[PDB]
Amino acid sequence: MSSPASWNKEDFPWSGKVKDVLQNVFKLQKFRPLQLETINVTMSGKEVFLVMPTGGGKSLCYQLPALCSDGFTLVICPLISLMEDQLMVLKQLGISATMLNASSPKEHVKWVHAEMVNKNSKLKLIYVTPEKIAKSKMFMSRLEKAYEARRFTRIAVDEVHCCSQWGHDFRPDYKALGILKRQFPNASLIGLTATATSHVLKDAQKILCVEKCFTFTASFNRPNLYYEVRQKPSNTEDFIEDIVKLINGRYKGQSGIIYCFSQKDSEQVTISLQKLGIPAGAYHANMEPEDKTKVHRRWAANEIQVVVATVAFGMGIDKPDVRFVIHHSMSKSMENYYQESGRAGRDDMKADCILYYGFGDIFRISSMVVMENVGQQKLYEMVSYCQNINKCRRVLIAQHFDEVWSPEACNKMCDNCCKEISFERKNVTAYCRDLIKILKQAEDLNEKLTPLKLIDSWMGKGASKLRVAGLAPPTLPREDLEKIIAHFLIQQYLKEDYSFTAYATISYLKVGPKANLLNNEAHVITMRVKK
Amino acid sequence: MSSPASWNKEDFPWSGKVKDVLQNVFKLQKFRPLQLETINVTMSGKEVFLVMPTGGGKSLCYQLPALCSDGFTLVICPLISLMEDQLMVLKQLGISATMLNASSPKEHVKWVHAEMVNKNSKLKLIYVTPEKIAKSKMFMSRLEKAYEARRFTRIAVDEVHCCSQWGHDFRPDYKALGILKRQFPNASLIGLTATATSHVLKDAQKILCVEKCFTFTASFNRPNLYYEVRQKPSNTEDFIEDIVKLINGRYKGQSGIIYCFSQKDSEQVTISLQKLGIPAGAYHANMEPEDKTKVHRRWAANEIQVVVATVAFGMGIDKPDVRFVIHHSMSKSMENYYQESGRAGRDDMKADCILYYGFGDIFRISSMVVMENVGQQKLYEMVSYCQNINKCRRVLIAQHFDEVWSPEACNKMCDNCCKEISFERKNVTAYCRDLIKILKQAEDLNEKLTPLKLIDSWMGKGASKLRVAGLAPPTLPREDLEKIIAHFLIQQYLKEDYSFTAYATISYLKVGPKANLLNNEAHVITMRVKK
DNA sequence: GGATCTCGACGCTCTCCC
DNA sequence: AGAGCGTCGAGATCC
Ligand SMILES: Nc1ncnc2c1ncn2[C@@H]1O[C@H](COP(=O)(O)OP(=O)(O)O)[C@@H](O)[C@H]1O
Ligand SMILES: Nc1ncnc2c1ncn2[C@@H]1O[C@H](COP(=O)(O)OP(=O)(O)O)[C@@H](O)[C@H]1O
Ligand SMILES: [K+]
Ligand SMILES: [K+]
Ligand SMILES: [K+]
Ligand SMILES: [K+]
Ligand SMILES: [K+]
Ligand SMILES: [K+]
Ligand SMILES: [K+]
Ligand SMILES: [Mg+2]
Ligand SMILES: [Mg+2]
Ligand SMILES: [Zn+2]
Ligand SMILES: [Zn+2]
């Protein structure tokens, strides 16, 4: 909500030191957007909140000032693997930093305690969990004693959106960080986040007891990324063959990421690509630091070409020259797909974001997110993105980023913008009636229909007992019928029915709520068909 | 082959009449190469043999002299279809000509007989079968009467290669044709042919008793023709879709020819092209004269865009502005492909020769040509042409016309010459060992394998009984495997085994004779692939 | 008559998250 | 336990 352009100077007393720590210590060349302004706000002793996408370079905005200020910097991070992620790079660069989780032994805990009060303990960044602030009586004590000794000067809050309710990813410990700025007022506070709306940001400002605060948000639009949606072949081996052909065609030798829904799927793709001559490796977030360094250094040294990652996992893979991100299966939500695909083309040059749309993936993910009360809705948003053939994909993604998406032209940088066929709207009402006929007949016979059984009964296949008498199967291929059934699902003419078995959660199809709209013979249902 | 440059007039006693008949009677502008010289040797009262490709314009070389001399010219034609074709061309032009076969009615025979001795008879060309000469005494008597009356002066023997028992199909009746030059020595004889085969050319000089005569042959190389080979999709509808796409992309509005292997194939192809918006028309040599005129007037007036014909013996389509000849299936032989594709670009301008190579076409045609003792070898030459991706197609075709093909540079007039692909010899011996393992096991389980069954067992598909225990299916697509199997068949590492059923001939695959060449470890089977 | 493609019925496999 | 997949037998179509 603030204008960072006024802070994009280098004439501050600290700008020389900042530039060198960036070039000779951090081994970087020039600042990414909003980094210099955020750093300049922090070095001036003011609080600042930075909203910036994952993989953008948010961490530097507090790591570099910690090396330009005196003493140490406290970093509130909620999860331990994420900490170790930062710590690896931190003292791989030669920056003495440390960690405090619940499970650290007494040796290290007392060493850290003595180092906070030490005068040239070379330590510059202490990462701690919010429980260490909320539920540790005297961690606060020597925090205050280091403050009085001018050693405690900066606070960095990761995932600041976790402070506010009417928000998601709420960690309750985040209430108690309001003590920090209350007890440490001269210490400058910086909060960083990638998923935050201003309505939540202001609540977090109130919660942290930071009223006057700058708010910089980055342009989430990445014009160098090309968004594309491709059909997912039902055969897994044909799918891997198509992936290998695409990689060898467009991205021969270029580094890339392949996102899979499951860990089994990612291991699966790693070995399959390896057998077909594409050097690949797997990466896991709940990983040992060392094998993280292993997969990372094999990727950087181009020893392997493609990194196979899991959806809610990646969280630390960071390569500037990622030329393509292939989604082996669609993501749980549109925001998740944005943050996942966006890790590509961090060098601001052209990169491709390919997504493979599979009919069965819809119901796998739907069956997986049943416990999330909004999982199905966000998944249907993703499915509607995959089904859309006319709108520019950048606009579709922008629909979920109203506050952080600059209204910029796509410049023919997505498959729909380049697709030079205009479309026409087919009346699909007959197909909906036929599907409802099938579903009601299966309901009468006490039979539950999986999407596959519904499709087969529609095509005159599957169990003869489940077929409606005299229903002529449509003249369209399986894929088109799948898109039609998906469309009916989104418009809620059909609805999902989850059944919980001892082994897994199965998703059947049932007549939807809006189906009664068909009682109107004048009711028309329209779809947009390729030419 | 004689030197025709000395016969390149314009100063002969008949050159005025020749030019007048060419421009005012035949409505032509300029002589095609070797037309002038041949007509001149004929008008000087000498015998001549003309070798010119199908569609070159050979008929004029005997039609024009008959219109400059007095009386009529006898034309020996083996088949009735070519007779009706020439009768069309002559009757439209207002040139009175007639034909007399065994199946001609009584009064028509009487009419021709009375017309021969008639002095004021407007008849200029009498087409007859060699049986009319061999097995008709009354016809020979009328020929004698006309010869002595100075009305019969010229003899034209079409498809003269039929005299020889070495050329393409030999007619026994043609053996008797040697009586003509024996009974009418002052009558000038011209023999026409498209298959040069100079052994055959010395023959039927022997048979016709014309051994001392001029023999002109044309340059078979057509530099304006671009030779290309494309892949035939296994699905027939994708096949027709590709044909429509090619025509609408490259050849909007241009006249074209589509050669099909089977009659029903050509019919189907017309109907499917019409359904897709390409005005098409079918043509068969054994057609009524009226509908042949129908199809030709629809083609000339651009009322139909493409003409689909089956590869029979007797395709007189003969249109000057044929911009593309697409072979829906490969041809039985290389010479056949040349003669068929050569109908393109008769105006000496650029024209395309598209060839659709299908794996199953090999075995249709091999099953069809089992009685021709050399049919399989020539079909394999065709297959070797289709498989070749490096050598210039012009050189490959010219290898079969060594005496009549001038060694001229292609100048990027074929698909392989224009592509700038570097090539690499891949070792494929392991694939041959695997295939031989499969076929040998199928012999062990005492079963015969069709090409489809062998390729399926190679890919781990089809009947489990026919699968090799430990054979891993190759990582290449099915079509690449079709390419490998075709290469092994051509090189005789595999062989065909025909089985005769009550309604068709099946083609199975068995271990080939050269397979034993693998006893040596140093034996390598290389295949040239893109790099 | 045999290959080739469908249908259908029976046995078998597997059970998708971070 | 249920859904889905692979495999084989029986029927239909074609030459
Ligand atoms: N100014 C910059 N120039 C070049 N690379 C940068 C810059 N800032 C950050 N990076 C790189 O981006 C990668 C990911 O940044 P990170 O700090 O993880 O951002 P976030 O915390 O938003 O995920 C890091 O490996 C870092 O080396
Ligand atoms: N000199 C020429 N100029 C223009 N067209 C010609 C010439 N000679 C022949 N043609 C045309 O070529 C077509 C086919 O020739 P044709 O006599 O059938 O040769 P062939 O007997 O070798 O098939 C004829 O329709 C004719 O009109
Ligand atoms: K300022
Ligand atoms: K692209
Ligand atoms: K061309
Ligand atoms: K040549
Ligand atoms: K095949
Ligand atoms: K066959
Ligand atoms: K079926
Ligand atoms: Mg981040
Ligand atoms: Mg001819
Ligand atoms: Zn766009
Ligand atoms: Zn060439």
Short mmCIF file of C-alpha atoms in Angstrom, two decimals, chain B residues 179-480:
data_model
loop_
_atom_site.label_atom_id
_atom_site.label_comp_id
_atom_site.label_asym_id
_atom_site.label_seq_id
_atom_site.Cartn_x
_atom_site.Cartn_y
_atom_site.Cartn_z
CA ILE B 179 3.83 -59.63 -90.82
CA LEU B 180 2.99 -55.93 -91.17
CA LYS B 181 6.43 -54.70 -92.26
CA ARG B 182 6.66 -57.91 -94.28
CA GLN B 183 3.53 -57.20 -96.34
CA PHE B 184 3.66 -53.37 -96.39
CA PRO B 185 7.34 -52.43 -96.77
CA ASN B 186 6.61 -48.93 -98.11
CA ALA B 187 4.48 -48.26 -95.01
CA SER B 188 6.45 -46.34 -92.39
CA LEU B 189 6.41 -48.00 -88.96
CA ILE B 190 6.61 -46.20 -85.61
CA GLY B 191 6.66 -48.11 -82.32
CA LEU B 192 5.79 -46.37 -79.06
CA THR B 193 6.79 -47.40 -75.54
CA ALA B 194 7.52 -46.13 -72.03
CA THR B 195 9.87 -48.88 -70.72
CA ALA B 196 13.22 -48.49 -72.39
CA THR B 197 15.16 -51.63 -71.40
CA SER B 198 17.26 -51.62 -74.57
CA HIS B 199 17.41 -55.43 -74.62
CA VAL B 200 13.65 -55.19 -75.14
CA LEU B 201 14.20 -52.43 -77.71
CA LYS B 202 16.40 -54.72 -79.82
CA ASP B 203 13.64 -57.24 -79.38
CA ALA B 204 10.53 -56.42 -81.41
CA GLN B 205 12.81 -54.93 -83.94
CA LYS B 206 13.56 -58.60 -84.23
CA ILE B 207 9.84 -59.42 -83.99
CA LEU B 208 8.58 -56.57 -86.20
CA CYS B 209 11.37 -57.10 -88.79
CA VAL B 210 12.39 -53.44 -88.39
CA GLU B 211 15.83 -54.15 -86.89
CA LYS B 212 17.47 -51.30 -88.86
CA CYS B 213 15.67 -48.18 -87.64
CA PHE B 214 16.04 -45.05 -85.54
CA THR B 215 15.44 -45.27 -81.79
CA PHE B 216 14.84 -42.02 -79.88
CA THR B 217 14.59 -41.98 -76.09
CA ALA B 218 13.62 -39.05 -73.89
CA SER B 219 15.40 -37.71 -70.83
CA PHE B 220 13.44 -39.42 -68.05
CA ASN B 221 14.69 -36.93 -65.44
CA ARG B 222 12.05 -34.29 -64.65
CA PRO B 223 13.92 -31.52 -62.79
CA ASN B 224 10.71 -29.63 -61.96
CA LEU B 225 9.39 -32.49 -59.78
CA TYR B 226 9.94 -32.42 -56.01
CA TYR B 227 10.04 -35.91 -54.48
CA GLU B 228 8.91 -36.29 -50.87
CA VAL B 229 7.99 -39.23 -48.64
CA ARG B 230 5.67 -38.74 -45.66
CA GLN B 231 4.47 -41.07 -42.91
CA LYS B 232 1.11 -42.80 -43.31
CA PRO B 233 -0.88 -42.68 -40.04
CA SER B 234 -2.18 -46.07 -38.93
CA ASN B 235 -5.68 -44.67 -38.42
CA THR B 236 -7.44 -44.15 -41.75
CA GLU B 237 -9.36 -41.06 -40.62
CA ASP B 238 -6.21 -39.27 -39.44
CA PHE B 239 -4.89 -40.29 -42.86
CA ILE B 240 -7.69 -38.51 -44.72
CA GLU B 241 -7.41 -35.57 -42.31
CA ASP B 242 -3.71 -35.27 -43.16
CA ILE B 243 -4.49 -35.42 -46.87
CA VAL B 244 -7.08 -32.64 -46.57
CA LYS B 245 -4.67 -30.61 -44.44
CA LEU B 246 -1.88 -30.98 -47.00
CA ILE B 247 -4.12 -30.05 -49.93
CA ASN B 248 -5.65 -27.03 -48.17
CA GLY B 249 -2.24 -25.90 -46.91
CA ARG B 250 0.04 -26.26 -49.93
CA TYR B 251 -2.27 -26.84 -52.90
CA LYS B 252 -5.34 -24.53 -52.65
CA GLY B 253 -7.26 -24.78 -55.91
CA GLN B 254 -4.56 -26.70 -57.73
CA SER B 255 -5.30 -29.82 -59.73
CA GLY B 256 -3.94 -33.03 -58.26
CA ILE B 257 -3.86 -36.80 -58.52
CA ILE B 258 -4.20 -39.33 -55.70
CA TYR B 259 -3.10 -42.89 -56.48
CA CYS B 260 -4.69 -45.64 -54.40
CA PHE B 261 -3.74 -49.30 -54.22
CA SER B 262 -7.25 -50.82 -54.19
CA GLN B 263 -10.46 -49.92 -55.98
CA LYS B 264 -12.49 -49.65 -52.79
CA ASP B 265 -9.60 -47.63 -51.36
CA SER B 266 -9.97 -45.05 -54.15
CA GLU B 267 -13.77 -44.96 -53.79
CA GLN B 268 -13.56 -44.48 -50.00
CA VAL B 269 -10.89 -41.81 -50.52
CA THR B 270 -13.18 -39.84 -52.83
CA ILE B 271 -16.14 -40.04 -50.46
CA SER B 272 -14.04 -39.05 -47.44
CA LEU B 273 -12.44 -36.16 -49.33
CA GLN B 274 -15.88 -34.91 -50.37
CA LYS B 275 -17.07 -35.10 -46.76
CA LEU B 276 -14.09 -32.92 -45.77
CA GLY B 277 -14.72 -30.24 -48.40
CA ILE B 278 -12.21 -31.20 -51.11
CA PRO B 279 -13.97 -31.63 -54.49
CA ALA B 280 -12.73 -35.02 -55.65
CA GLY B 281 -13.48 -37.46 -58.42
CA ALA B 282 -12.68 -41.11 -59.06
CA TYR B 283 -11.16 -42.52 -62.24
CA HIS B 284 -10.73 -46.11 -63.42
CA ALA B 285 -9.30 -47.31 -66.72
CA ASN B 286 -12.18 -49.74 -67.36
CA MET B 287 -14.83 -47.03 -67.58
CA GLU B 288 -17.53 -46.03 -70.03
CA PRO B 289 -16.28 -43.45 -72.56
CA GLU B 290 -18.98 -40.96 -71.56
CA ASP B 291 -18.08 -40.87 -67.87
CA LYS B 292 -14.39 -40.64 -68.75
CA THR B 293 -15.30 -37.50 -70.68
CA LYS B 294 -17.32 -36.47 -67.61
CA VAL B 295 -14.41 -36.76 -65.18
CA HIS B 296 -11.99 -35.12 -67.61
CA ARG B 297 -14.26 -32.12 -68.25
CA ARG B 298 -14.84 -31.75 -64.50
CA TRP B 299 -11.08 -31.80 -63.88
CA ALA B 300 -10.14 -29.44 -66.73
CA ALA B 301 -12.78 -26.90 -65.70
CA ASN B 302 -11.49 -27.18 -62.10
CA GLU B 303 -14.93 -28.46 -61.11
CA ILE B 304 -13.22 -31.25 -59.17
CA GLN B 305 -9.89 -30.53 -57.53
CA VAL B 306 -8.26 -33.96 -57.15
CA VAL B 307 -8.71 -37.13 -59.19
CA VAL B 308 -8.20 -40.39 -57.28
CA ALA B 309 -7.27 -43.36 -59.45
CA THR B 310 -6.30 -46.91 -58.63
CA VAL B 311 -2.98 -48.12 -60.02
CA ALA B 312 -4.25 -50.26 -62.90
CA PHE B 313 -2.67 -50.63 -66.36
CA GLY B 314 -4.22 -47.96 -68.58
CA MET B 315 -4.53 -44.70 -66.57
CA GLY B 316 -5.00 -42.06 -69.27
CA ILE B 317 -5.66 -39.03 -67.02
CA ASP B 318 -3.08 -36.89 -68.85
CA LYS B 319 -3.59 -33.34 -67.61
CA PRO B 320 -0.93 -30.62 -68.12
CA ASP B 321 -1.22 -28.69 -64.83
CA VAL B 322 -1.11 -31.47 -62.24
CA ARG B 323 0.52 -29.71 -59.28
CA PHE B 324 0.75 -32.70 -56.93
CA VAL B 325 0.59 -36.50 -57.11
CA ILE B 326 -0.05 -38.09 -53.71
CA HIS B 327 0.46 -41.85 -53.47
CA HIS B 328 -2.14 -42.95 -50.93
CA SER B 329 -0.14 -46.20 -50.79
CA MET B 330 3.29 -47.15 -52.06
CA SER B 331 3.54 -48.57 -55.57
CA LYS B 332 4.33 -52.14 -56.57
CA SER B 333 7.68 -51.12 -58.07
CA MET B 334 10.03 -48.18 -58.52
CA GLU B 335 9.38 -47.88 -62.26
CA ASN B 336 5.67 -47.84 -61.47
CA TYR B 337 6.20 -45.01 -58.98
CA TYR B 338 8.13 -43.01 -61.55
CA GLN B 339 5.52 -43.48 -64.28
CA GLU B 340 2.66 -42.61 -61.90
CA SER B 341 4.23 -39.60 -60.18
CA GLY B 342 5.51 -38.28 -63.52
CA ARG B 343 2.01 -37.09 -64.37
CA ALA B 344 2.84 -34.02 -62.28
CA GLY B 345 4.16 -30.82 -63.80
CA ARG B 346 3.73 -31.57 -67.49
CA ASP B 347 3.97 -27.79 -68.01
CA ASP B 348 7.65 -28.07 -66.92
CA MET B 349 6.89 -26.06 -63.76
CA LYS B 350 7.28 -27.10 -60.14
CA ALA B 351 5.09 -29.97 -58.94
CA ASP B 352 5.16 -32.18 -55.85
CA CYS B 353 5.33 -35.99 -55.67
CA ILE B 354 4.05 -36.96 -52.22
CA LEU B 355 4.42 -40.60 -51.15
CA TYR B 356 2.55 -41.99 -48.10
CA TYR B 357 4.58 -44.84 -46.60
CA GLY B 358 2.57 -47.30 -44.51
CA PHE B 359 3.94 -50.35 -42.71
CA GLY B 360 0.89 -52.50 -43.52
CA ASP B 361 1.01 -51.50 -47.20
CA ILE B 362 4.20 -53.57 -47.53
CA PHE B 363 2.34 -56.68 -46.63
CA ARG B 364 -0.88 -55.91 -48.61
CA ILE B 365 1.16 -55.57 -51.76
CA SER B 366 3.48 -58.47 -51.01
CA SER B 367 0.38 -60.60 -50.46
CA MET B 368 -0.98 -59.32 -53.78
CA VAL B 369 2.16 -59.91 -55.88
CA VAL B 370 3.01 -63.44 -54.72
CA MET B 371 2.47 -64.85 -58.22
CA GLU B 372 4.83 -62.38 -59.90
CA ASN B 373 8.14 -64.21 -59.48
CA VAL B 374 9.92 -60.83 -59.16
CA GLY B 375 7.10 -58.87 -57.49
CA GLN B 376 8.46 -59.14 -53.95
CA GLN B 377 11.93 -57.93 -54.96
CA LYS B 378 10.57 -54.81 -56.68
CA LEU B 379 8.24 -54.10 -53.76
CA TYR B 380 11.26 -54.38 -51.47
CA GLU B 381 13.08 -51.88 -53.69
CA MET B 382 10.06 -49.60 -53.15
CA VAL B 383 10.26 -50.13 -49.39
CA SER B 384 14.00 -49.39 -49.40
CA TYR B 385 13.19 -46.13 -51.17
CA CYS B 386 10.62 -45.24 -48.52
CA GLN B 387 12.97 -46.08 -45.66
CA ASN B 388 15.84 -44.06 -47.13
CA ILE B 389 16.28 -40.70 -45.39
CA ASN B 390 19.77 -39.65 -46.54
CA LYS B 391 20.28 -40.42 -50.24
CA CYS B 392 18.78 -38.13 -52.85
CA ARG B 393 15.49 -39.54 -54.10
CA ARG B 394 16.34 -38.52 -57.66
CA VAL B 395 19.43 -40.74 -57.60
CA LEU B 396 17.42 -43.60 -56.09
CA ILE B 397 14.83 -43.41 -58.88
CA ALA B 398 17.50 -42.84 -61.54
CA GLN B 399 19.21 -46.09 -60.55
CA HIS B 400 16.31 -47.90 -62.26
CA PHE B 401 16.59 -45.86 -65.51
CA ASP B 402 20.34 -45.92 -66.09
CA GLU B 403 20.21 -45.87 -69.89
CA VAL B 404 17.51 -43.16 -70.16
CA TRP B 405 18.23 -40.97 -67.10
CA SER B 406 20.68 -38.15 -67.71
CA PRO B 407 22.97 -37.81 -64.66
CA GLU B 408 21.76 -34.34 -63.66
CA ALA B 409 22.02 -32.60 -60.30
CA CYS B 410 18.94 -32.61 -58.09
CA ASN B 411 19.48 -28.99 -56.97
CA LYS B 412 17.43 -29.40 -53.76
CA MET B 413 14.46 -30.94 -55.60
CA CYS B 414 13.66 -33.66 -53.05
CA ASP B 415 12.92 -33.83 -49.34
CA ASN B 416 16.22 -35.45 -48.37
CA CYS B 417 18.31 -32.95 -50.35
CA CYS B 418 16.71 -29.90 -48.70
CA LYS B 419 16.82 -31.04 -45.07
CA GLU B 420 20.08 -30.18 -43.31
CA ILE B 421 19.97 -33.13 -40.93
CA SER B 422 23.20 -34.77 -39.83
CA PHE B 423 22.96 -38.55 -39.77
CA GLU B 424 24.26 -41.29 -37.51
CA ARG B 425 24.62 -45.06 -37.89
CA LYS B 426 22.87 -46.68 -34.92
CA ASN B 427 23.64 -50.31 -34.12
CA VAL B 428 20.39 -52.29 -34.22
CA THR B 429 21.77 -55.84 -33.93
CA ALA B 430 20.22 -56.36 -30.49
CA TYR B 431 16.76 -55.59 -31.88
CA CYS B 432 17.33 -58.23 -34.57
CA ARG B 433 18.38 -60.76 -31.93
CA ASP B 434 15.25 -59.99 -29.91
CA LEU B 435 12.99 -60.33 -32.96
CA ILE B 436 14.64 -63.63 -33.89
CA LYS B 437 14.13 -64.79 -30.30
CA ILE B 438 10.41 -64.00 -30.59
CA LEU B 439 9.99 -65.69 -33.97
CA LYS B 440 11.98 -68.76 -32.91
CA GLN B 441 9.89 -69.10 -29.74
CA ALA B 442 6.74 -68.78 -31.85
CA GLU B 443 8.06 -71.64 -33.96
CA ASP B 444 8.66 -73.54 -30.70
CA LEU B 445 5.12 -72.93 -29.48
CA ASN B 446 4.29 -74.05 -33.05
CA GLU B 447 2.45 -70.87 -34.06
CA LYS B 448 2.60 -68.56 -37.07
CA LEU B 449 3.11 -64.84 -36.45
CA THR B 450 1.68 -62.03 -38.53
CA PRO B 451 3.70 -58.77 -38.54
CA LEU B 452 1.15 -57.30 -36.14
CA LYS B 453 1.49 -60.24 -33.74
CA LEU B 454 5.30 -60.10 -33.85
CA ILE B 455 5.37 -56.35 -33.22
CA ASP B 456 2.84 -56.79 -30.39
CA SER B 457 4.89 -59.52 -28.70
CA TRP B 458 7.89 -57.21 -29.10
CA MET B 459 6.08 -54.46 -27.18
CA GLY B 460 4.81 -56.79 -24.45
CA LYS B 461 1.28 -56.74 -25.88
CA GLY B 462 -0.99 -59.24 -27.59
CA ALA B 463 -1.22 -62.87 -26.55
CA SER B 464 0.94 -63.66 -23.53
CA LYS B 465 1.72 -67.09 -25.00
CA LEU B 466 3.68 -65.35 -27.79
CA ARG B 467 5.73 -63.12 -25.44
CA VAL B 468 9.37 -63.89 -24.68
CA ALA B 469 9.98 -64.55 -20.98
CA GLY B 470 12.63 -61.91 -20.28
CA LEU B 471 12.42 -59.62 -23.31
CA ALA B 472 12.02 -56.02 -22.22
CA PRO B 473 9.88 -54.08 -24.73
CA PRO B 474 11.98 -51.44 -26.50
CA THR B 475 11.78 -47.77 -25.56
CA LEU B 476 11.02 -46.76 -29.16
CA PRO B 477 7.53 -45.98 -30.50
CA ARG B 478 5.66 -48.61 -32.48
CA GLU B 479 6.33 -46.89 -35.81
CA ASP B 480 10.07 -46.75 -35.13
#
